[PDB]
Amino acid sequence: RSYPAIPRIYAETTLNMLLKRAKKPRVHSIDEYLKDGGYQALEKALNMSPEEIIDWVDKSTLRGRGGAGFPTGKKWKFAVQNPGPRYFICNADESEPGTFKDRIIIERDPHLLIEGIIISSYAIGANEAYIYIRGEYPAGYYILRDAIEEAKKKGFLGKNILGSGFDLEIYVARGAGAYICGEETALIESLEGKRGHPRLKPPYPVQKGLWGKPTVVNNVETIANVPFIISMGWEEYRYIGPSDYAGPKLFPVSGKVKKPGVYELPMNTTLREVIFKYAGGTLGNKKVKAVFSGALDCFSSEELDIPMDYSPLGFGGTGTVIVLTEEDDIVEAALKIAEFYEHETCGQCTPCRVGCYEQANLLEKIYKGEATEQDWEGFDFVNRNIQPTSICGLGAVAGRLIRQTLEKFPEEWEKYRKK
Amino acid sequence: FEFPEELKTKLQEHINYFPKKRQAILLCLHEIQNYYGYIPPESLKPLADMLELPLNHVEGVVAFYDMFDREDKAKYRIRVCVSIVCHLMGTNKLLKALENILGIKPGEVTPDGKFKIVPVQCLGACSEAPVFMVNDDEYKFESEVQLNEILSRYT
Ligand SMILES: NC(=O)/C(O)=C/C=C/N(C=O)[C@@H]1O[C@H](COP(=O)(O)OP(=O)(O)OC[C@H]2O[C@@H](n3cnc4c(N)ncnc43)[C@H](O)[C@@H]2O)[C@@H](O)[C@H]1O
Ligand SMILES: Cc1cc2nc3c(=O)[nH]c(=O)nc-3n(C[C@H](O)[C@H](O)[C@H](O)COP(=O)(O)O)c2cc1C
Ligand code: SF4
Ligand code: FES
Numbered sequence: 001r002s003y004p005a006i007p008r009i010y011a012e013t014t015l016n017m018l019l020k021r022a023k024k025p026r027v028h029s030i031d032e033y034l035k036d037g038g039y040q041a042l043e044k045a046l047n048m049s050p051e052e053i054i055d056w057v058d059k060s061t062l063r064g065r066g067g068a069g070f071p072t073g074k075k076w077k078f079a080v081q082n083p084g085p086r087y088f089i090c091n092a093d094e095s096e097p098g099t100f101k102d103r104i105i106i107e108r109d110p111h112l113l114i115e116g117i118i119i120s121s122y123a124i125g126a127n128e129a130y131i132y133i134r135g136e137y138p139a140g141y142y143i144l145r146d147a148i149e150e151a152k153k154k155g156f157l158g159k160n161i162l163g164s165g166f167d168l169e170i171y172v173a174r175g176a177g178a179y180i181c182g183e184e185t186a187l188i189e190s191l192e193g194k195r196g197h198p199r200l201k202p203p204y205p206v207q208k209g210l211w212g213k214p215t216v217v218n219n220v221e222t223i224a225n226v227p228f229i230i231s232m233g234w235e236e237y238r239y240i241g242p243s244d245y246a247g248p249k250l251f252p253v254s255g256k257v258k259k260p261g262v263y264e265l266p267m268n269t270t271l272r273e274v275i276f277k278y279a280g281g282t283l284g285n286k287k288v289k290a291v292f293s294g295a296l297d298c299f300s301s302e303e304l305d306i307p308m309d310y311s312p313l314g315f316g317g318t319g320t321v322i323v324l325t326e327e328d329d330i331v332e333a334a335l336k337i338a339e340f341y342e343h344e345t346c347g348q349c350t351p352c353r354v355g356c357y358e359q360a361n362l363l364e365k366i367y368k369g370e371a372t373e374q375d376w377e378g379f380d381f382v383n384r385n386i387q388p389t390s391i392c393g394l395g396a397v398a399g400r401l402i403r404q405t406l407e408k409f410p411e412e413w414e415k416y417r418k419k
Numbered sequence: 420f421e422f423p424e425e426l427k428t429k430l431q432e433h434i435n436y437f438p439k440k441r442q443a444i445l446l447c448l449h450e451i452q453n454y455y456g457y458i459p460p461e462s463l464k465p466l467a468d469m470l471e472l473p474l475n476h477v478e479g480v481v482a483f484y485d486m487f488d489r490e491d492k493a494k495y496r497i498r499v500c501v502s503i504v505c506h507l508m509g510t511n512k513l514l515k516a517l518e519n520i521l522g523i524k525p526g527e528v529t530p531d532g533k534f535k536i537v538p539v540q541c542l543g544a545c546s547e548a549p550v551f552m553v554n555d556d557e558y559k560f561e562s563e564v565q566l567n568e569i570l571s572r573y574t
Contacts, residue, residue: 004555007547097502097541128438135449135486136498136542138555171437176445177485179540193441193470195483252545254504260546292503322504322545336503343540346483 001146003027004139010261011104012278015240017248018224019264022108027143030150033111039156041230045119046164048230053123054080057226060234061246065101066091066219067296067318069310075216079124079206082214088126089191089210089217090117092133092140093175093182096294097340098322101250102220104262106133106140109224110147116223117170118156119230124216127167132187134175144172179344183392184217186346197346198392221250241266245309253279255323256286267309271299274308274321286325290408294320295337296397298404330409331367331416334402338363341386341398352395355386359399369419376417420461426454430469440470444480448487456492456532485539491528493535495573498552499525502541508548513560520567534573 013019021028021036033039045053058073079086090113094102105113113131121129133141148170151157159167178196180186185199188210209215225247229237238246251263251274258280265278271291275281282288291299296317299306308315324333342360347353362379365371371379383399383406390396406413422430433446447470451462458481467477481487488496497517501510514525517536523529525538544550547559553573560566 004557006557007544007550007559009544009546094543095541098504098545099541100543100545103543134543135445135484136539136552139557171442173437173442174445174449175484176448176487177539178483190445191442193439193444193472193480194476195479254545254548255507260548262546295503322507324507328507333503333507336506340502340540343485 003142006107006139009100009104010259011264012259012261013248013264015248015264015266017228017240017264018105018109018112018221018250019262020109021112022104024108026108028109028111030111030147030154033109034154037231038111039115039154041227042115042118042156043162045122045230046162046166050080050123050125053119053230056229056234057123060225060229060237061244062222062225062229063245063310064219065221065225065249065318067096069316072218072222075206075218076120076124078204079214079216082207084125085213086124086126087210087213087215088117088121088124088129089184089187089215090129090131090223091182091184091187091217091219092131092137093187094137094220095134095179095182096296096318096320097337098254098292098294098320099252099318100254101252101262101318101320103137103140104250105220105224106137107143110143111151112224112227113144113220114147114151114156114170116226118161118168119226120216120218120223121168122166126216127169129168129170130191130210131170131172132175132181132191133172134181135177141172141174148172178346179340180346180392180394183394186392187217188215195346197348200391241268242307242309245311245314249308249319251308251319251321253321253323255292256283256325256328257281257323258283265308267307267314269308270304271306271308271315271321272304275304275323279321279323282323282325284325286327288323289326289328290324290330290333290405292320292322292324292333292337292401293317294322295340295401298401298408300408330405330412331363334405335360335363335367337401341394345394345398349390349395351388352386352390352398355382355395356398358382359386359402363402366416369416420459420465422462422465426450430466434469441472444470444472444477445484448481448484452487456494458487458489460489491535492532493528494532495534495554496537496552497534498537498539498542500540500542500548500550501525501538504541504545505549509560510549513549513551513566516560516563516566519563520570534570
């Protein structure tokens with residue numbers, strides 16, 4: 001079986017959990033997975049009640065790895081308070097800049113993700129599950145389609161799984177180039193065969209989701225933790241990292257580091273340790289200027305001693321680490337972020353539609369030294385006014401990272417004002 | 420406009436795959452583009468009929484999703500990431516090397532209709548920056564010599 005070419009992303013682990021097999025850049029098929037005790041957590045899960053599974057996932061302290069860190073067990077509890085039929089959705093859209101953590105699991109250990117989907121679907125009583133994978137991950141799509149067939153042939157999917165009376169089908173949908181289809185309500189709209197337009201929340205998908213039914217949406221990485229929680233038990237899982245933000249976490253590190261790639265580390269690791277202890281420090285040993293947490297936040301070199309956890313002062317987000325060094329122009333980097341939001345706004349909300357466009361248009365004038373005094377004042381105003389009336393997280397953060405560069409690098413921005 | 424039997428059967432497979440016909444819309448458009456090298460505007464009405472959707476719903480979907488191209492026919496789409504990491508690590512060097520080999524810039528198609536350079540947002544392979552795709556295959560750009568050898572594999 002031949003798949004499209006994929007670059008071999010470097011992967012390293014100190015925990016040997018999500019990357020036990022995925023640290024090797026190749027597809028691990030079902031026989032190899034079974035030899036490691038794969039699908040044995042599913043067999044144990046089918047001998048537990050769905051309520052006991054929700055309870056262990058809750059007590060494990062597992063939090064959403066898609067970026068918001070919402071407690072997973074609590075999300076599942078909300079879905080099961082509502083009458084069925086219910087749906088389970090694996091979010092494999094992964095389109096945030098600098099983020100390549102989820103593809104590592106999909107392309108190398110698809111049975112870890114599949115086992116997690118089966119247990120999670122069983123826990124919430126869903127008989128249909130969906131993987132929504134971005135269109136620019138074609139190898140991941142083909143790998144998943146083949147792994148699901150391998151699971152079906154071994155009796156892990158279909159009707160009456162292992163004589164449990166539990167039925168499940170996993171469908172794989174493909175995206176077609178929209179970052180907004182990563183937002184869970186736009187993802188659902190896309191699964192329903194429409195334009196990827198987010199819906200006003202509340203209702204959250206656990207109340208009204210796919211076809212208006214209770215729906216759980218979880219990120220690939222969140223799901224890949226579920227077989228470990230069942231296999232080890234929640235207590236053992238909770239000894240990994242801080243007991244309040246437990247478990248392995250994947251950190252996609254890129255930019256000006258000696259060893260760019262994915263690192264599986266506990267969340268008590270600091271940002272400084274991620275860069276210098278694990279990613280081998282910086283290219284040419286240049287000083288760190290900034291760390292971009294995807295297109296969401298900008299951390300300065302004064303903020304490297306923070307933990308990589310979901311605490312109020314932790315790094316949070318997806319764990320995405322884009323390293324910029326002393327030579328990198330912050331204004332040129334801010335322009336790339338502005339261009340990203342300009343290209344990805346769905347355009348439903350007027351301040352987001354016009355503000356994402358104007359922020360990039362005016363920042364480009366500033367960068368080229370063609371901005372008037374009015375363009376400078378206009379850029380400042382637009383940056384502060386993308387969020388009003390926004391119905392999703394994109395409009396709420398389109399100006400966030402850029403505003404942080406204005407506050408943290410005033411001297412560099414001031415140089416452009418005089419240009 | 421009528422889909423050739425070989426394409427029509429593949430579209431029917433996608434339509435029968437999901438519990439509801441309309442959920443197959445993106446898989447069908449991906450299939451149409453793969454077959455023709457673009458989305459022919461005349462293909463939208465027979466597809467809308469197969470999905471049991473109004474034509475304007477299908478038109479709105481094609482306009483929304485960035486991978487779909489209704490204007491230029493290309494055998495190979497060279498998707499070049501122009502986002503933050505690849506920009507920092509050498510997108511301009513990759514774009515100059517593509518200009519030296521093929522004589523085209525982003526958004527342009529070669530006169531033979533073989534290659535089109537498509538600038539895209541983050542491809543999720545940032546540790547391998549600068550990243551590009553040649554249809555479904557993905558690569559890290561190393562140099563013009565390395566790139567030239569990659570492109571020679573697409574006939
Ligand atoms: N792999 C990738 O590339 C990747 O993961 C990229 C992600 C980029 N994103 C950009 O915005 C990240 O998303 C992040 C915002 O994402 P969100 O869904 O708007 O966040 P929310 O806090 O609304 O919800 C988080 C999850 O919990 C659920 N939920 C919240 N309250 C609930 C409530 N009362 N009852 C029930 N459910 C409830 C909600 O339904 C969703 O399920 C941003 O923090 C970036 O970190
Ligand atoms: C614009 C935008 C893009 C997002 N993209 C993704 C994505 O690619 N993958 C993902 O799992 N979550 C993404 N999210 C977050 C989801 O809406 C949602 O919080 C998540 O899938 C729920 O899973 P979790 O609790 O396991 O993290 C995005 C959110 C927004 C606002
Ligand atoms: S905030 Fe922006 S991306 Fe989100 S729904 Fe409104 S226009 Fe679309
Ligand atoms: S920024 Fe180019 S692959 Fe992510």
